[PDB]
């Protein structure tokens, strides 16, 4: 299918206790492959997936220097932000960024992303056409104009449509044995009291990759959201994911229900009953 | 306006320490250091974003260190200079959006084994020939600077107290007075051509100025001859209806 | 292992010629390219910058093109003037790094078109001493080359172009001198021909 590469960065200022802490992580689809932490001793970009271990010493220097530059860029962007919002030099603030690209199965560019957040709120974002910007407030509007006047979008689109795509494409080949692996959910069901009248049925999907999964409940072949609870998909820690879906049913009427599990790792969807 | 580097010239003795300074373009984001030897391209030394020194050449000598403590101005220090350090040291800075590098004039370093042969130039000005005037109606003056040892000189012409570029042409390089010798002194010529009628006016004053770079005022000197410090040497001539 | 090569290393041309200065690089993962001009003893003047996205860029008689796939960049100089004489430096930034990586440069000489050649040698006397004199070889066409000295006591500079701008007049010259008493300007330049 199609694929993604994303980087997520987090700068947290701490006035009076040194420079902002900067953390960046890289992902390919659902698999994390690199990290940098400005508080950690190495001062290096580091591997977090086995397939990226193939990269030579110059790749690690190159990525190290680029992520440390981002570190510096966001250190300055925090100071600017403070002035824009006229905030005091006392408090901690957070500058977050996300960027990356998607490619189709052919390996061709599908979409690119380049966006900022300040204290948990959208700040500015590159629009889908990779040529224009969306500012979320008056402060961000200053930045938008700055970037439009300087035609900054072009350099960003160039990265997204080129370097980003070539990188993703490369990682996908180097790590095909895992990144292009499919891992089917292993399913089962639990059953719990709740009360005098009703029990809960929980449908489990375990050890599946990629995260993308659909779990739905049905009563007599008719689906139900009415008394349905669907938890966040969660990491198992071994590179695979877990998720469950639950319904509340009348006690003694459990066989009336079925759970349906769709996942691209499945020849055909699975159907479970208590 | 642009990038400012100091000192523009430095002649030193092997084993001495030098310091170079760069004042980047105002609020320019990045500052870069380069090194360039004769007829070669600039080679990367180190760079800063703000005050962070984020990448330094892996071939950079232990004796070389840079810093940019406030962002803004940067310092490059060479400990115990060697003849191999002799080069043009180039500073550049780039803007936040473009990444276009803008360079300074450069700081030109010459490291000598010692300073025994450092010598300022002798300067002379040679008047237009009567035959040139008669044959072409133009009048060329030649300026000659001789016997200066380190080759750091800047020659300029002054006509009635104003520096002139029109009609000026100077040797691209100083020539070795004794080419087979390792410590040869140098010579340098320049021409200034005016119309005959401009030369024939006795009001018109022509000054050849040779700015020589040599010792600092505080380098020691034990030879009898005057301390061959950095100095200007000149020669001059006046027009005349012959 | 990025290698920037500049083609050709040096270039002498008649004034008014349309010039091609080539630059190639072995690694095409380029962020941007930059062209510089350098004049002897001096620093670098920035001429053109081309971003990865852009294909060409122009400033007056300068046009730079860029082909990332080819690993190639050309600088065109239209209507080359003697004033373009300089060393031209090609530099690239990698997607992977902030530094610029330089070529060795193309050394360019644009020879003036001398309208009315009048080769002549002249003797010029010192303004302060009637004793001291120099020889001036001037007004030869740009194709005439001056040869270096092979005599230990006679010094001969390379040729050099002056431009008297108000008169729109360019001329070539070289200078010769001696401290020797058998000095003679006539044959001091009988070692230079068209």
């Amino acid at each position: 299918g199609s694929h993604s590469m994303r980087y997520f960065s987090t700068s947290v200022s701490r006035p009076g206790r040194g420079e902002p802490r900067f953390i960046a992580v890289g992902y390919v689809d659902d698999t994390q492959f690199v990290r940098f932490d400005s508080d950690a001793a190495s001062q290096r970009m580091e591997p977090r997936a086995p397939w990226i271990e193939q990269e030579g010493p110059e790749y690690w220097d190159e990525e190290t220097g680029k992520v440390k530059a981002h570190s510096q860029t966001d250190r300055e962007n925090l100071r600017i932000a403070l002035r824009y919002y006229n905030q005091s030099e006392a408090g901690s603030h957070t500058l977050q960024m996300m960027f990356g690209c998607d490619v189709g199965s052919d390996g061709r560019f599908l979409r690119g992303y380049h966006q900022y957040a300040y204290d948990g709120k959208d700040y500015i974002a590159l629009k889908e056409d990779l040529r224009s910007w969306t500012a979320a407030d008056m402060a961000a509007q200053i930045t938008k104009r700055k970037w439009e006047a300087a035609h900054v979008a072009e350099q960003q689109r160039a990265y997204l449509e080129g370097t980003c795509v070539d990188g993703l494409r490369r990682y996908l080949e180097n790590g095909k044995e895992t990144l292009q692996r499919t891992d089917p959910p292993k399913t089962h069901m639990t059953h719990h009291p709740i009360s005098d009248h009703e029990a809960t049925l929980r449908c489990w999907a375990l050890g599946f990759y990629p995260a993308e999964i659909t779990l739905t409940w049905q009563r007599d072949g008719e689906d139900q959201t009415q008394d349905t609870e669907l938890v966040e998909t969660r990491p198992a820690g071994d590179g695979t994911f877990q998720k469950w879906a639950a319904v509340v049913v009348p006690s003694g009427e459990e066989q009336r229900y079925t759970c349906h599990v769709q996942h691209e790792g499945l020849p055909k969807p699975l159907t479970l009953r208590w | 306006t642009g990038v400012s580097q100091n000192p523009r010239h430095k002649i030193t003795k092997r084993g001495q320490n030098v310091t170079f300074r760069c004042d980047p373009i105002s609020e320019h984001n990045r500052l870069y250091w380069y090194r360039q030897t004769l007829g070669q391209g600039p080679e990367f030394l180190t760079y800063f974003q703000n005050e962070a020194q984020l990448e330094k050449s892996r071939l950079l000598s232990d004796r070389f260190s840079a810093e940019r403590p406030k962002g803004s101005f940067s310092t490059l220090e060479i400990q115990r200079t060697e003849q191999g350090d002799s080069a043009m040291y180039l500073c550049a800075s780039s803007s936040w959006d473009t990444g276009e590098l803008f360079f300074g004039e450069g700081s030109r370093l010459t490291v000598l084994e010692d300073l025994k042969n450092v010598f300022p130039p002798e300067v002379a000005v040679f008047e237009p020939s009567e035959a040139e005037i008669s044959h072409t109606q133009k009048a060329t003056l030649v300026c000659l600077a001789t016997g200066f040892y380190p080759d750091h000189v800047e020659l300029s012409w002054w006509v009635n107290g104003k520096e002139v570029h029109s009609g000026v042409c100077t040797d691209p390089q100083p020539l070795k007075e004794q080419p087979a010798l390792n410590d040869s002194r140098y010579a340098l010529s320049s021409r200034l051509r005016v119309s005959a009628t401009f030369w024939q006016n006795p009001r018109n004053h022509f000054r050849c100025q040779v700015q020589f770079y040599g010792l600092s005022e505080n380098d020691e000197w034990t030879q009898d001859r005057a301390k061959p410090v950095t100095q200007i040497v000149s020669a001059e001539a006046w027009g005349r209806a012959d | 292992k990025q290698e920037v090569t500049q083609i050709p290393a040096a270039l002498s041309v008649p004034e008014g010629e349309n010039l091609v200065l080539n630059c190639s690089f072995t690694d095409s993962a380029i962020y941007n390219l930059q062209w510089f001009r350098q004049d002897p003893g001096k620093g670098l003047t920035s001429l053109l910058l081309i971003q990865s996205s852009q294909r060409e860029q122009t400033s007056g008689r300068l046009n730079a093109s860029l082909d990332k796939s080819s690993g190639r960049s050309t600088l065109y100089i239209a209507a080359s003037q003697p004033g373009d004489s300089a060393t031209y430096l090609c530099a690239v930034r990698m997607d992977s790094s902030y530094k610029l990586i330089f070529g060795s440069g193309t050394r360019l000489l644009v020879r003036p078109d001398i309208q009315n050649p009048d080769p002549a040698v002249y003797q010029l006397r010192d303004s302060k001493s009637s004793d001291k004199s120099v020889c001036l070889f001037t007004d030869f066409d740009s194709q005439t080359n001056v040869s270096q000295s092979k005599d230990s006591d006679v010094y001969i500079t390379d040729k050099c172009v002056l431009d008297m701008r108000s008169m729109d007049f360019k001329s070539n010259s070289a200078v010769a001198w001696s401290n020797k008493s058998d000095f003679a300007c006539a044959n001091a330049f009988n070692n230079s021909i068209i």
Binding site: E62, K66, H70, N77, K146, C164 | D97, G99 | -
Partner: peptide, 10 residues
């Protein structure tokens, strides 16, 4: 491959 940060100034 990390991008460069030219143009990222608020």
């Amino acid at each position: 491959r990390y991008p460069l940060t030219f143009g990222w100034c608020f």
